[PDB]
Design a protein around this ligand. Structure first.
Ligand code: NAI
Ligand code: NAI
Lengths: 262, 262, 262, 262
């Protein structure tokens, strides 16, 4: 396979049962890693995800957990160490979103998105870094951000805030723990072909509208994001820390400015 | 009288009893505005500040409120509209911070900083914009950020995350409500001479270290930031929205590279 | 009279005979400054502008010069010091642009834009700072940039590159000369109502397309930018150096994401 | 090997005889690519570089050329196509630098650095894109930038300007040619162990000073940058365009802020 240093590394992935999380689980499985698949409630998809990792060449366990509960995040990292003996790569991928005019967004709805997308990632990063620090492991954290840590997002002010926060969180942790050889990075996906979007992307006018925001002209395949994760996790990225690697087909480059407009 | 257009405008300021909030309160008093001074803890300080605003030529009330409580933020804007008749400028300035190695940061401590620094500003921004939209007012929001929406801050990952989040919140709201003429900006102070830093700056070793990180060579004066706030609230900045204006003596320009090191 | 501290300050402005440079010339006249109007091509325009500055309450000369010629830039600053006694504010505003598919852009055409937009501002900045350093003056430099130091611009790769370069030049000079109290900032205009755009904005289809890319919904007025320049040159912005202040009606916030598309 | 899609791809590298250029040449040779090594005057190092690529498993030619001469850049890309049949990846790596107080920097010295570091890269990118466009190849451009497209650099205002320009150049070309499947990216190296630095890094106090600017605590090995180039060139980065991938051991994260300072 591609990244031989990933062989037998322990990789924890929150929200790893579907979409980008699942595609990363499979990709690490192709690198013969040991994958720990976290999931919220859908056991059967998690079980499905588990079998793919094994069929791709990896070992895999599944572990239920809500990333807004501190005990569940703590339990997740502990289960990883118990079952597989160590922890090498931590991937905070869980996320939720919903459209609301910002002046109408409730505090409860704001909190759900902040608690899930930002705080969940802090909790995961923290538990992983604690472990690397205590055991002198030169481990790796990948936080799943979005083009919306840079691109503002009307109707999604909670989501945008959560990812803008994630960017400074990641950059801080990278600076703080760089002297220990612990690397911390964001991946910034653009529009991706995942379950959350299956409804929207079946509709031809909506699919075309979205593709018109993508300079490369196509909706990303989850494996293209998983390719970025494998690179970032591997020793090929040994000197790469504190960055956001956008995988967005050019979306952060301002799609409205194609053909020299404005 | 510099910004004549500010005369009789209603300006609400959270944490307006001390430091930067106080300086802003005074300055808008100097512009003959109607300043609403929110405070959490210390009525005696708020009273002392209410006096300065009045002496400087402004009108002022004080309103107790905790920015982490929705009812208190809603109450604050409603009080402003009761007492002064309307709302023109909403300044979300309240903030807290404390150093903790990130892998040792507790969830409650992380939540306290996020709730105060980011969510409080969301609540502030939401209530003001709600009022602007329902009443066809071309209102203005100033969110008080930090060099640390750009500069990562080891030991302060909660703070850094809250301001990185504030950046994207501001940018989103500016984009979302620009067609209504409602403008939303951040100010980014560097190291400022305020109570929050009084401990640090007393120690001449610590004061010198902080100063060695400011290219302009001096710790900022709170009036230098209030000058930026008066500009942004004024019609002078009519085409200016969604920005962060750093008032930092050069701090975001990378202190370590002075004289060309590296 | 807004910024009383600007009275009798010597302000040099390249391309000060038309558009934004003219608006800045007028505005500093309104602050009772001594405006030096550089121009390349059209004395009759420069004369018409010299008049406005004088009517608005300022003192003004005109000086012919090509900003791509070192001798002309050196001459310009030397003329300013001859005629008015000193130099306080140096504004590098001259710029050119033309659309060409990048793979068809000639080296001479690329050079013309770089030489004019970036190198001319370097020469301007260098000569002013040289004068500030030798004479212990806490001078000020405003470099006129664009949304396109951040927004990429197909068909205008030369322009975009010149302003991206201007950004780092400004930031470097701000860092390098901050300990001397010399401040250096950029302004970043979006789509502005100037001669350079008169062709584009005459066509009602083209005017509407440009407007659909401004969140605030209108093409900027040149006085809105001159208001930003007066602020930055003034002592109100005493702690502000090394920044880019965008005056763009929200354009850097990603036009394509209005109403929450994507 | 690692990236099997790189097998037999034609890769042109300017300044490919030494340092980062040489390390990329060798790394592509390890991927069994066909490497075209450009060089300014040192034929013997270029010859040395050539033999390494072959010994690593690649094909390789050397071609003399000065990137400030348009004909030399044109000849380089033509020689690549002539000799190897096509062009797949273009790498603009040539660069020069020297320290000068900015107010003392000559126009000739400014131009040399601009012409080499920025214009050379425009010329290379242009000739490559022309070829990809004319022949419907989904090719790849990698422009060698620096941490100094983001980190300002006193005494190196020409270098900083050149790389700030390179950033907007790359981003523009990525947006412009994304619909054609042509990807364009920057790599941003921090302090790297290359010949230009051998003098500085032999001295223990200077080596320690530099390492103190690096959060990861070590000077980068050229192969760590070449690892980024291989990733970016490969189809693993299929959805990655218009980005700068910093490989700097955390240098852009503000080294002066370690341990919670300021
Ligand atoms: N002083 C500095 O060097 C810098 C401060 N700025 C920011 O500017 C703002 C102003 O702070 P300073 O005046 O410097 O310090 P400060 O501590 O004097 O002011 C902060 C204010 O926030 C208030 N506050 C805290 N929690 C609150 C709550 N739950 N509800 C209502 N009010 C609450 C405090 O009562 C206080 O008056 C802060 O957001 C700070 O983060 C950021 C960058 C640097
Ligand atoms: N108008 C707009 O929408 C925007 C313009 N700004 C920038 O603001 C600046 C002002 O331009 P505008 O007033 O809008 O257009 P303009 O074309 O009216 O002004 C540009 C000025 O530069 C001068 N100039 C050109 N080459 C010169 C040379 N070699 N030597 C001396 N002067 C020379 C011209 O004579 C002209 O007066 C420009 O740098 C432009 O790039 C940037 C963003 C948007």
């Amino acid at each position: 396979h591609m990244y031989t240093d990933l062989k037998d590394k322990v990789v924890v992935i929150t929200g790893g049962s579907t979409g980008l999380g699942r595609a990363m689980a499979v990709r690490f499985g192709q690198e013969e890693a040991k994958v720990v698949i976290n999931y919220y409630n859908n056991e059967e998809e998690a079980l499905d995800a588990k079998k793919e990792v094994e069929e791709a060449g990896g070992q895999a366990i599944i572990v239920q957990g809500d990333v807004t509960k501190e005990e569940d995040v703590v339990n997740l990292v502990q289960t990883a160490i118990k079952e597989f003996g160590t922890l090498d790569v931590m991937i905070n991928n869980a996320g939720v979103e919903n459209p609301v005019p910002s002046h109408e967004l409730s505090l409860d709805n704001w909190n759900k998105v902040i608690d899930t997308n930002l705080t969940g990632a802090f909790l995961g990063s923290r538990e992983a870094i604690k472990y690397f620090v205590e055991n002198d492991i030169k481990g790796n954290v990948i936080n799943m951000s979005s083009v919306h840590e840079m691109i503002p997002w009307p109707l999604f002010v909670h989501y945008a805030a959560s990812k803008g926060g994630m960017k400074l969180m990641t950059e801080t942790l990278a600076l703080e723990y760089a002297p220990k050889g612990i690397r911390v990075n964001n991946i910034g996906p653009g529009a991706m072909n995942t379950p959350i979007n299956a409804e929207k992307f079946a509709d031809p006018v909506q699919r075309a509208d979205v593709e018109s925001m993508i300079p490369m002209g196509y909706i990303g395949k989850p494996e293209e994001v998983a390719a970025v994760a494998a690179f970032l996790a591997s020793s090929q990225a040994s000197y790469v820390t504190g960055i956001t690697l956008f995988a967005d087909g050019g979306m952060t480059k301002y799609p409205s400015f194609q053909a020299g407009r404005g």
